[PDB]
């Protein structure tokens, strides 16, 4: 089983606070990095060509868009703007099947306070762990600590520069590059629950 990708539109329409915050992160602008003459210095350090247009190179786009190589995902032949940049489904998982449960569950909660178990969403493909997905992009290089590495690899590795060292427990809390967290009403409950969920909700900004 597995759900296809659809893009950021629906998620963004119901979750405007996260979407507006996400919009300003490096992830949202990931495709701009593949354009000619952008990030020239970093590209030279990694021995890449600073003037090359890498926006349609299959050795690069896969980690700068949503669901490359997966059903419903971004393709160089049909590069959907709503799948351009590392977006919502790249971390939360393809949403085709679970976004429907977010709608119905939210309606049920608004009408009667009924909560829905996270177990139902995980069954529909939602990710509440994240490590593996971040790793498929950030730790995808030869000999990396992550067991799933396979080409094409990311040019940006600790070997190129120590700043490219990725540690999940640290980076997932990187407030300068992850979307801000906002308070949830509590529609969903139970396991699997992200290990830092309560920590993030206790420190979250008001839903407004
Ligand atoms: C409106 C019809 C929604 C759409 C479209 C999507 N989501 Fe949703 N989501 C919705 C509700 C009413 C809730 C509960 C909010 C609350 O206050 O409790 C959610 C919740 C989430 C969560 C949090 C899950 C948890 O562990 O508690 C996430 C991470 C989330 N939604 C993500 C998400 C994504 C990526 C979507 C696009 C595929 C998406 N949602 C669509 C309502 C709606
Ligand atoms: C591939 C589809 C990715 C997934 C999944 C995740 N990240 Fe990522 N991240 C990716 C790229 C291509 C970039 C660079 C964007 C650009 O063009 O500039 C990034 C960047 C970050 C950063 C900022 C840079 C840094 O400080 O290291 C952070 C903090 C980051 N990414 C974190 C992160 C986490 C915690 C993820 C899983 C929840 C995650 N990323 C997934 C590509 C991809
Ligand atoms: C996933 C396996 C990737 C492939 C294939 C490529 N890139 Fe990407 N890129 C990836 C990550 C995880 C990051 C973030 C690194 C960090 O920690 O900051 C990036 C980042 C870039 C950047 C920005 C670098 C910086 O600002 O210092 C550029 C310019 C970039 N990537 C270009 C690029 C090109 C041209 C690729 C094909 C040759 C390419 N990347 C592939 C992950 C992945
Ligand atoms: C990986 C780099 C992510 C991207 C891209 C997006 N989100 Fe996210 N989101 C991420 C994490 C690790 C978490 C915490 C999980 C938890 O259960 O605590 C979240 C959480 C949310 C939530 C829950 C409420 C909140 O924390 O604000 C929502 C509604 C949510 N995310 C929505 C969302 C949307 C619409 C995105 C695309 C614009 C999006 N997220 C991208 C990691 C990542
Ligand atoms: O519909 S409720 O989750 O705001």
Q: Whose CA is nearest to atom 3 of ligand 5?
A: 106
Please give the backbone phi and psi of residue 84, each rounded to the nearest 5 degrees, phi first: -90, 130
The answer on whether 197 is annotated among ligand-binding residues is no
3-state secondary structure the chain: CCCCCCCCHHHHHHCHHHHHHHCCCCCCCCCHHHCCCCCHHHHHHCCCCCCCCCCCCCCCHHHCECCCCCCCCCCCCCCCHHHECCCHHHHHCCCCCHHHHHHHHHHHHHHHCCCEEHHHHHHCCCCCCCHHHHHHHHCCCCCCCCCCCCCCCCCCCCCCCHHHCCCHHHHCCCCCCCCCCECCCCCEECCCCCCCHHHHHHCCECCC
d(CA 82, CA 72): 12
Structural determination approach: X-ray
Ligand 4 centroid – CA 186 distance (Å): 15
Q: Whose CA is nearest to atom 14 of ligand 1?
A: 187
d(CA 136, CA 160): 18
CB of residue 177 inside a 6 A radius of ligand 1:
no
d(CA 159, CA 167): 15
Measured in angstroms, the resolution is: 1.8
CB–CB of 152/137 below 8 Å? no
Q: Which residues, 6 or more positions from 176, have their beta carbon under 8 angstroms from its beta carbon? A: none
**Is 61 exposed, middle or buried, given 0-12, 13-18 or 19+ CB atoms closer than 10 A?**
buried
Q: Whose CA is nearest to atom 26 of ligand 4?
A: 181
Alpha carbon of 116 to those of 55, 88, 190, 194: distances in Å? 41, 21, 9, 16
Ligand 2 centroid – CA 27 distance (Å): 6
Q: Please state whether beta strands 188-189 and 116-117 pair in parallel, antiparallel, or not at all (unpaired).
A: parallel
CB of residue 59 inside a 6 A radius of ligand 5:
no
Alpha carbon of 6 to those of 65, 81, 111: distances in Å? 12, 11, 28
CA atoms within 13 A of residue 92's CA, in its CB half-sphere: 21
Name the residue range of residue 199's domain: 1-208
CB–CB of 17/182 below 8 Å? yes
Domains identified in the chain, total number: 1
CB–CB of 117/189 below 8 Å? yes
Q: Which atom of ligand 5 is nearest to the CA of 107?
A: 1
Residue 188, strand partner residues:
116
> Longest C-alpha distance within the chain, in Å?
58
Ligand 5 centroid – CA 128 distance (Å): 20
d(CA 50, CA 53): 9
d(CA 8, CA 88): 6
d(CA 43, CA 88): 26
Supply the CATH number for residue 36's domain.
1.10.1130.10
CB–CB of 85/25 below 8 Å? no
């Amino acid at each position: 089983a597995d759900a296809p990708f659809e893009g950021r539109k629906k998620c963004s329409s119901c979750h405007k606070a996260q979407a507006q915050s996400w919009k300003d992160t490096a992830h949202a602008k990931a495709m701009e990095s593949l354009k000619p003459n952008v990030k020239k210095e970093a590209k030279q350090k990694a021995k890449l060509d600073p003037a090359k247009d890498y926006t349609q190179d299959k050795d690069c786009v896969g980690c700068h868009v949503d669901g490359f190589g997966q059903k419903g995902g971004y393709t160089i032949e049909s590069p959907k703007p709503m799948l351009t940049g590392v977006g919502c489904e790249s971390c939360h998982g393809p949403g085709r099947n679970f976004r429907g449960d977010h709608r119905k569950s939210g309606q049920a909660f608004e009408k009667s306070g009924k909560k829905t178990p996270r177990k139902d969403l995980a069954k529909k493909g939602q990710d509440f762990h994240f490590e593996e997905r971040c790793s498929a992009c950030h730790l995808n290089y030869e000999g990396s600590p992550w067991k799933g590495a396979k080409a094409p690899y990311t040019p940006f590795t600790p070997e190129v520069d120590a700043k490219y060292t990725f540690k999940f427990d640290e980076m997932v809390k990187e407030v300068k590059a992850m979307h801000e967290h906002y308070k949830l009403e509590g529609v969903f409950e139970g396991e699997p629950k992200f290990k830092f969920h309560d920590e993030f909700q206790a420190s979250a900004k008001p839903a407004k």
